[PDB]
Every structure is written in C-alpha cells, then in structure tokens.
Amino acid sequence: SKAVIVIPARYGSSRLPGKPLLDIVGKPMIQHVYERALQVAGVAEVWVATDDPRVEQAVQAFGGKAIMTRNDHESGTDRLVEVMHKVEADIYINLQGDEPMIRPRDVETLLQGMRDDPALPVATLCHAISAAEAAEPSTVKVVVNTRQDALYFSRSPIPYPRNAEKARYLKHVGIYAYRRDVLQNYSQLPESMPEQAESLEQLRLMNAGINIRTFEVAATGPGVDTPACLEKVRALMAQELAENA
Amino acid sequence: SKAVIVIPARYGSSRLPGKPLLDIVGKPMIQHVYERALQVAGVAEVWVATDDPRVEQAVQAFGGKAIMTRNDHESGTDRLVEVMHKVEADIYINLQGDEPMIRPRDVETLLQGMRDDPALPVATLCHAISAAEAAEPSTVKVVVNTRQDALYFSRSPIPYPRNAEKARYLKHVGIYAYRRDVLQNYSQLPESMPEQAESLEQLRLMNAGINIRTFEVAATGPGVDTPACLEKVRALMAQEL
Numbered sequence: 185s186k187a188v189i190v191i192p193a194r195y196g197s198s199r200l201p202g203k204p205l206l207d208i209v210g211k212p213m214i215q216h217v218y219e220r221a222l223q224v225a226g227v228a229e230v231w232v233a234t235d236d237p238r239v240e241q242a243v244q245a246f247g248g249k250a251i252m253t254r255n256d257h258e259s260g261t262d263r264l265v266e267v268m269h270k271v272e273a274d275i276y277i278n279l280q281g282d283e284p285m286i287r288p289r290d291v292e293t294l295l296q297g298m299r300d301d302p303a304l305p306v307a308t309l310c311h312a313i314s315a316a317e318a319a320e321p322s323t324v325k326v327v328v329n330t331r332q333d334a335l336y337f338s339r340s341p342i343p344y345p346r347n348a349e350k351a352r353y354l355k356h357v358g359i360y361a362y363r364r365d366v367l368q369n370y371s372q373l374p375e376s377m378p379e380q381a382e383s384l385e386q387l388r389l390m391n392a393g394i395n396i397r398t399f400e401v402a403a404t405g406p407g408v409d410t411p412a413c414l415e416k417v418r419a420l421m422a423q424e425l426a427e428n429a
Numbered sequence: 430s431k432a433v434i435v436i437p438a439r440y441g442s443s444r445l446p447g448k449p450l451l452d453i454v455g456k457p458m459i460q461h462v463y464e465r466a467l468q469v470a471g472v473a474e475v476w477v478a479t480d481d482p483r484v485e486q487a488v489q490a491f492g493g494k495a496i497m498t499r500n501d502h503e504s505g506t507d508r509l510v511e512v513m514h515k516v517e518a519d520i521y522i523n524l525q526g527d528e529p530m531i532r533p534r535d536v537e538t539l540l541q542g543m544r545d546d547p548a549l550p551v552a553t554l555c556h557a558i559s560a561a562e563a564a565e566p567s568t569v570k571v572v573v574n575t576r577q578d579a580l581y582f583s584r585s586p587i588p589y590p591r592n593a594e595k596a597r598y599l600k601h602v603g604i605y606a607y608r609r610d611v612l613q614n615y616s617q618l619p620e621s622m623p624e625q626a627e628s629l630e631q632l633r634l635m636n637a638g639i640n641i642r643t644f645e646v647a648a649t650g651p652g653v654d655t656p657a658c659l660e661k662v663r664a665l666m667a668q669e670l
C-alpha cells in the first residue's frame with residue numbers, strides 16, 4: 185500500500201499575494217510544510233502541486249519535488265486529480281500549503297486509519313471546539329456517528345443547541361486522505377445543492393454517497409490567512425526552535 | 430409484505446389535556462386520523478395505541494381498533510415498540526394522532542418506497558419550505574443526498590446560506606415507516622449526543638448508522654399542539670366540506 189503526500193500551493197492570493205513564499209524563521213512557508221510532511225512515517229514521496237513557476241522555483245531551490253498543474257483548476261481537489269494521473273499511489277494525502285504548524289503525528293493517525301480499513305474511501309480530521317468558536321461561519325463544523333463517519337459538514341452550528349449543556353462541537357481540519365479510485369471517479373461527480381449553498385467542496389462526496397471517516401485529534405495550531413495570525417505563527421514557530429535545544 | 434398503521438395517542442398534553450378526544454367538526458380528532466388511515470391502500474390493519482381507557486372506549490365506539498399500552502413511555506416511538514410485540518407485521522407505519530389533515534396519498538408514497546426497496550430500514554417524509562421558515566428552531570430541517578437518503582436532521586438552518594440563491598430547504602414531516610427488525614433492535618440503541626442536544630429522537634437511528642430515506646411531498650396541513658392551532662384546523666376542516 186503506497187501512500188504519497190501532495191501539497192497544493194497556489195501563489196495567487198487576495199489578502200496574501202504569494203502566500204507560500206512568506207518567510208517564517210528564515211524559510212518560506214511552503215518549505216516548513218514540506219519538511220514536516222517528510223517526517224511522516226509510511227509515506228513514499230512528497231510533492232508540491234502548483235500553477236505558478238515562482239513557487240516551482242522556490243520548491244526546487246530547497247530540493248523539493250514540484251509538479252506544474254493547470255491554473256484553470258477551481259479547487260485543491262481538482263488539482264490533486266491531475267497529479268494522480270502522473271504520480272502513482274494507492275493513497276493520496278492532501279495537505280494545505282498554508283498550514284506550517286501541522287503535526288506529523290496527526291497525518292500518521294489519518295494514514296493508519298486508511299490502512300486499518302481497506303473499504304474506507306476518504307478520511308479527514310477534526311478537533312473539539314467551544315460553543316463560542318462554533319458560532320463562526322468561517323469555521324466548519326462536523327457531526328459524526330458511532331463509527332466516526334461524518335453525517336454532515338456545515339458552517340451552521342451543528343448540532344443545534346436546544347439543550348445547550350449537552351452539545352459538543354467538532355471543528356473540521358482540512359486534511360484529507362483519498363483512495364486512488366475515489367480520485368479516478370471524481371471529475372464525473374456533479375455539484376450538489378448543499379455544496380453550492382455552503383461552499384464546501386467535501387459535500388460533493390457526501391452527495392454521491394461516498395463515506396468520509398473523521399478522526400479526532402488535539403486542537404491544531406493557527407493557520408495563515410490574516411497578518412494577525414501570521415505573527416503568532418512566527419512567534420510560536422520561533423518559541424518551538426528554542427524549546428527543542 | 431404485511432404493513433400495519435399504528436397511531437400513538439396518549440390522553441395527556443401540557444397545553445391540551447385529553448387531546449385525541451377534542452371535537453373537530455363533529456368527530457374527535459383521533460377519529461379523523463383513523464378514518465384517513467383506513468383510506469391507505471396496501472395496509473392490512475390500523476391500530477390506535479393509547480394509555481387511557483377513555484380514549485380506548487371512544488375508538489371502539491366508532492368501530493376502530495385500539496390497544497392499551499404502558500403509561501411510562503416517553504415517546505410514540507417507544508409505544509410503537511410495545512405494539513410490535515403484540516401486532517405482527519413486516520412494516521410498521523407511525524402516524525401522529527394530532528395531525529387530522531394527513532393525506533392518505535402521502536402515506537402510500539411512503540409505503541411504496543419501502544416496498545420498492547427491501548433493503549430500506551426506515552423511510553420518512555419532507556416538503557419544501559422558504560428560507561424564512563427554515564430559520565425557525567421549531568421547524569426541523571433535513572438535508573438529503575442524490576438517492577434521497579438523509580444526511581442529517583437539525584433545528585439549525587441547513588444548508589447554511591453562504592450563497593443564498595443556491596440554498597433550497599426541506600422540512601421534515603414526522604411520519605415514519607419502520608421495518609420490523611429495526612423495532613426489535615430499538616431498545617438496544619444508546620442515546621446520542623446530537624439527539625440530546627437537538628432534542629430529535631430520529632438522530633438516535635442515524636447515530637447507529639441506520640439509513641433513513643426521505644420522500645418529498647407537497648406542503649402539509651398543521652398539527653394540533655396549541656389551542657390556537659386547534660381553532661385553525663377546525664376552520665380548515667370546515668371549509669374542506
């Protein structure tokens with residue numbers, strides 16, 4: 185069972201032009217993700233999928249593997265489907281190019297889940313959040329059954345707090361593991377109404393009846409979208425280098 | 430494939446004591462539901478499951494069949510499980526005793542769905558509602574997939590309207606059809622966190638991984654919970670003559 189990690193890294197970004205190239209403790213952001221991806225046991229290769237030559241050059245400059253993809257891609261999943269035809273594997277893991285604080289152990293949990301159940305098509309991550317955080321539409325909530333299979337993903341607070349003290353919220357962490365066959369049949373899937381309404385691409389899979397198992401992990405580090413969080417990542421990243429002395 | 434209709438009708442109610450016996454244009458509410466249930470093709474028997482002797486006698490008075498059940502049940506679903514042991518069938522349809530405006534056609538759609546797919550454990554109904562109506566916590570929303578299987582039931586407006594013009598809403602209509610095996614295993618199912626938070630008993634089934642197919646019908650008539658709704662139903666059933 186061969187598994188590879190693909191890191192989609194688009195340059196073009198509105199509030200952060202050239203986001204993967206931003207410096208964090210002397211290295212571009214994309215490098216931090218790549219270095220951490222390399223620490224994941226059981227992975228054969230790590231690739232960076234991009235549509236911009238400046239990102240491809242930055243990646244090659246530190247010796248990483250880069251693959252140019254079409255710029256007409258509407259999402260990180262469509263970009264992964266194109267990489268799938270060229271890079272062979274049984275399990276593809278999609279890592280965000282803008283989350284430099286990813287824990288290698290969490291990706292291993294995801295990979296072990298896939299290997300422990302050959303019938304599982306897709307696997308993703310989640311962590312507990314408070315009711316106050318769950319109120320934000322920018323945060324994606326998920327509700328699961330006893331087998332930890334996702335029932336639904338939403339920007340609306342789910343479950344609804346009728347009996348508030350009984351509610352427990354789970355935040356969806358955008359890291360995915362796909363079986364090869366799911367990606368091969370992906371482009372044939374039509375867009376769903378819930379997907380278009382919520383603007384959550386993962387609902388396209390749920391519409392087609394494709395099961396998505398969600399594994400729970402500890403609260404993850406802050407991502408990078410706002411320059412307010414960027415400074416916290418830099419200080420948090422630097423604080424980490426001094427701790428491991 | 431024997432199918433039976435069970436109408437849970439306890440005497441008590443916080444807002445309308447003795448609800449099943451309330452008069453609606455000459456007949457107690459329970460009789461209206463029972464008579465409409467009798468118009469459903471493909472059903473072998475119709476039973477009223479009750480906890481009170483006054484309800485039982487009223488049903489027998491008009492010629493219907495009634496069965497006494499325990500008074501300690503918390504839901505009509507639990508009451509149905511007790512009946513399943515006494516009345517043998519392959520498919521059990523659970524009708525609300527306080528929804529006298531039920532269309533026999535809608536119950537037939539539900540029954541046909543169960544018969545068209547032997548693997549289907551549970552089936553229920555739903556109908557389109559506006560975005561304004563979906564915002565109400567008292568209205569239960571449901572989201573389905575291409576095969577019309579429910580993904581989740583919630584009091585929250587789902588799907589979330591990020592792109593408002595793309596969102597389409599469905600309201601869950603509390604009528605259910607259960608395969609016998611589901612009812613035999615019901616008492617073993619643990620309550621779920623989502624069930625307790627939302628206060629929706631059907632989430633106990635989803636938690637256990639039991640599939641629930643949702644069939645779409647036209648907007649339904651109002652139920653009778655408050656004395657205000659009772660006056661509206663009386664008016665609606667009067668002009669319907």
Ligand SMILES: Nc1ccn([C@@H]2O[C@H](COP(=O)(O)OP(=O)(O)O)[C@@H](O)[C@H]2O)c(=O)n1
Nearest residue numbers: 192193194197257258259260263280281282
């Ligand atoms: N059309 C797109 C959109 C996102 N992506 C990538 O997929 C991940 C998730 O994107 P995102 O939610 O942070 O939104 P943006 O990165 O586009 O600002 C990032 O690594 C993106 O660069 C992509 O490769 N192609």
Ligand SMILES: Nc1ccn([C@@H]2O[C@H](COP(=O)(O)OP(=O)(O)O)[C@@H](O)[C@H]2O)c(=O)n1
Nearest residue numbers: 437438439442502503504505508525526527
């Ligand atoms: N403990 C209970 C609660 C409801 N029910 C029945 O289930 C149906 C719907 O009840 P409901 O929960 O929606 O509202 P209530 O009738 O309980 O006030 C009615 O026909 C009730 O008589 C029951 O048989 N036993």
